[PDB]
Amino acid sequence: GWGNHCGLFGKGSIVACVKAACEAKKKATGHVYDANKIVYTVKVEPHTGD
Amino acid sequence: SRCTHLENRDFVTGTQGTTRVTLVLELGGCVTITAEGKPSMDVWLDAIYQENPAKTREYCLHAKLSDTKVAARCPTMGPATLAEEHQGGTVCKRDQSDRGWGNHCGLFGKGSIVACVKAACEAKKKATGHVYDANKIVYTVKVEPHTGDYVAANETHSGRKTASFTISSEKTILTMGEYGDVSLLCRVASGVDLAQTVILELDKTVEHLPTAWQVHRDWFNDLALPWKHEGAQNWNNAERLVEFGAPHAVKMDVYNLGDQTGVLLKALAGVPVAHIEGTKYHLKSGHVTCEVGLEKLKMKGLTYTMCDKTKFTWKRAPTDSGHDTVVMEVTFSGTKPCRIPVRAVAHGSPDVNVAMLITPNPTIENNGGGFIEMQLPPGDNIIYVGELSHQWFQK
Amino acid sequence: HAVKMDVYNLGDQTGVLLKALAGVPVAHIEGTKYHLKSGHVTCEVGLEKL
Secondary structure, three states, rough: OHHHHOOOOOOOOOOOOOOOOOOOOOOOOOOOOOOOOOOOOOOOOOOOOO | OOOOOOOOEEEEOOOOOOOOOEEEEEEOOEEEEEOOOOOEEEEEEEEEEEEEEEEEEEEEEEEEEEEEEEEEEOOOOEEEOHHHHHHOOEEEEEEEEEOOOOOOOOEEEEEEEEEEEEEEOOOOOEEEEEEOOOOEEEEEEEEEEOOOOOOOOOOOOOOOOEEEEEEEEEEEEEEEEEEEEEEEEEHHHHHOOOEEEEEEEEEOOEEEEEEEEEEHHHHOOOOOOOOOOOOOOOOEOOHEEEEOOOOEEEOOOOEEEOOOHHHHHHHOOOEEEEEEEEEEEEEOOOOOEEEEOOOOOOOOOOOEOOOOOOOOOEEEEEEEEOOOOEEEEHHHEOOOOOOOOOOEEEEEEEEOOOOOOOOOEEEEEEEOOOOOEEEEEOEEEEEOOOEEEEEEEEE | OOOOOOOOOOOOHHHHHHOOOOOOOOOOOEEEEEEEOOOOOOOOHHHHOO
């Protein structure tokens, strides 16, 4: 309206935007396994009396 | 007129004899007072606040843990102990771990283990509550006379006056320039009850957040977070943000539950905001009833001659104000000061003046005047400012 | 309001995520190795040459 420098009193269009990024070290990342690349490690130790 | 700047506007009108007017002013509202033989006045409650209110508890939203210490004893060696278990400002957990030859104990069995961390709060990660004292709260009321000058919201009206009220000082007499004196009696006791209110403050320097919230005392007192009194060195219930892992041999992990700000903010959605300006803690919603004394107010320019009916032009053609009134502004090129000859007729009845003026005794002063606000009946009308005319369809 | 519109940030969601993650099993990362902390495998052990 006149109070904010418009000729008419009514609804005026307004649009606001912000650039959105992510804070450093504030991510949550997911990882998936490939059954063909997964490794199983097995250890064996003899009973040596020690 | 200031009230034309907002959507929330009320009109109060005093008739014959009405010398006093009782209004209920609300934050975000505005009242236009009109009365026979009196200059019109715009009045509004501008702020409600208290400087340096008392602080109740401070809560910690993000624990800063450091100096993790663990003490463990073999099954026959007795209780494990740390000096920290007796210090304030530390969180500890005593448990039992499985011990045996593998971790250097003579026997295979349960051994005592105790782990402690020093618990403090991250800088700027506090949530502090404040309480109002009804005897120290201030209500600010503004008054502005209708001078026939239009001023935008970002501009300052030279005739605007401010009055402050506290419970112990309920009456003020304001001198409205040449319009006389107006008396204001506002009772803070008629205002908002603040017994169950707490103003919650996080970090007011954060840019994308309100500076404060108005929350319920019982909700605030039940927050499951570490807390302390301002000034106290350590936190009570610091364990609320710390978890201990199951022990294994001579070790026990300490986990931090992270920053609780996001959690709090979800709880605060839908809660009303408040505002902090330095040391002033403001309510953003509230009301107060005032009695306005109009008897000492006098109109301006009643003895001027009528302006030359030939010298008016439209600076701002008649326009809808949004309050079912019409606003306009004229320019006068004749000799000042003088009374503006304004009137309006319904299409077809040139004899009956149908204009109800909001602006009192419109005049063109040596350095002002010209803005007029009026109400007209529905339908086609013609507005006249002397010989200057304008068609106007009302509604 | 008039020619302005405020933008609010909902804050760090880490605390919210961590509450959801309580009771979820942990895993472990060692450099480029992504380890499971729970699991099993069946093996056949040949003893004839011992």
